[PDB]
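Interim report, section 4.2 (structural modelling).
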Amino acid sequence: TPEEAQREKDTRISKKMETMGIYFATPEWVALNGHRGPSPGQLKYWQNTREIPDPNEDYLDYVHAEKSRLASEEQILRAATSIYGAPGQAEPPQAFIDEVAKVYEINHGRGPNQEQMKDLLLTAMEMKHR
Amino acid sequence: TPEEAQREKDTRISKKMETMGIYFATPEWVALNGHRGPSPGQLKYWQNTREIPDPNEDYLDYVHAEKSRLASEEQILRAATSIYGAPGQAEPPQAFIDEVAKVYEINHGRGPNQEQMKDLLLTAMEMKHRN
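Predicted structure of the assembly:
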């Protein structure tokens, strides 16, 4: 039974891809990719663009591409807690967390540079006073 | 002493500046700015770079530029809840919120475009299917 067999193989590959954080790799997408997993080109494309990669083109321009630095609210929160330097290592105010996340947004998903760090430190020094 | 008067006028300008969310405009920075608030150029520089603007430069090259659209974690959360389409204003999983925030990070602080929206919708369909 090739229909149920390949359907189940697609669901197994897709499940293994989904647990790996590869969200676009649905069972349907795996089936359209030739019942096969995503290529490094498609994977890198999704990692750097968050656009669904076309299932049957291999994206040979993305195979050797640098993983785009992308930060999670959790990483932003950790960096904000470290920069704020709160007494008792406590979470900073949400306004400072928003400022740090906006800094990450300005840097295409990267952390603050040494000039943005002076701004974040001055903001912390002004917020812990107020 | 006119110096303490100037200090108090600086501190009042600084209070009005940060009540508005303009954080860099400390009393000290206002005093270094010529005892006045930030110019539109300085304010554009800080809004677009989050770097402290030099206190007496006019940053005109940023006057004729436009304000970068940034997003807060609250705006990210609202966009994630709207895109996920949860019944009853229910928070999406933190993985989907992280996906939306990473989309925002790719766009220099902007919202998702059409193709990133289709990706986020497919991701939502898979997260509601598995959960």
